[model samples]
Target: KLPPGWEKRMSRSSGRVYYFNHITNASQWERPS
Candidate 1:
């Protein structure tokens, strides 16, 4: 489970929220469209 306020994000377009771990470089923010 993700830690509280640890890896959370809110999209500006749809206001969609997501969570991920940065240390593993597996965050969607780092992915190419």
Candidate 2:
């Protein structure tokens, strides 16, 4: 799934998207594999 507390979020103005990890402080670039 989303690698524990991994979260997906995006910029409100731009189409930019990134992932945030609750469990892991430093969220990685790509989706947690």
Candidate 3:
């Protein structure tokens, strides 16, 4: 579960803690395209 005010916190630049990247890159040299 998320922490209290986590959603609101996420909206703020300073409040961002974790990321929610939907797609992952294959490797360091590879890019998602």
Give the Cα lDDT of each candidate. Answer: 0.58, 0.74, 0.31
Q: In TM-score terms, which candidate is top?
A: 2
Tell me the TM-score of model 3: 0.18
Model 1 residue 5 distance off true place after TM-score fit, in angstroms: 11
What is the Å distance of residue 12 in model 1 from its true position?
A: 1.1
Between candidates 1 and 3, name the one with more favorable lDDT.
Answer: 1
Candidate 3 error regions (>4 Å): 8-33
Tens-digit lDDT track for model 2 on 2-31? Answer: 767889878578777778888766655577
Candidate 3 residues 1-33, lDDT tens each?
A: 532222212435555344333344112222223
User: Is 2 or 3 the stronger prediction by TM-score?
Assistant: 2
Off by over 4 Å in 2: 12-14
Supply the TM-score for candidate 2. 0.55
TM-score of each: 0.44, 0.55, 0.18
**Order of quality (lDDT):** 2, 1, 3
Worst 10 residues of 2 by lDDT: 23-32
| Superposition error at 25 for model 3 (Å) | 30
RMSD to the true structure for each prediction, in A, is 6.7, 1.9, 11.7
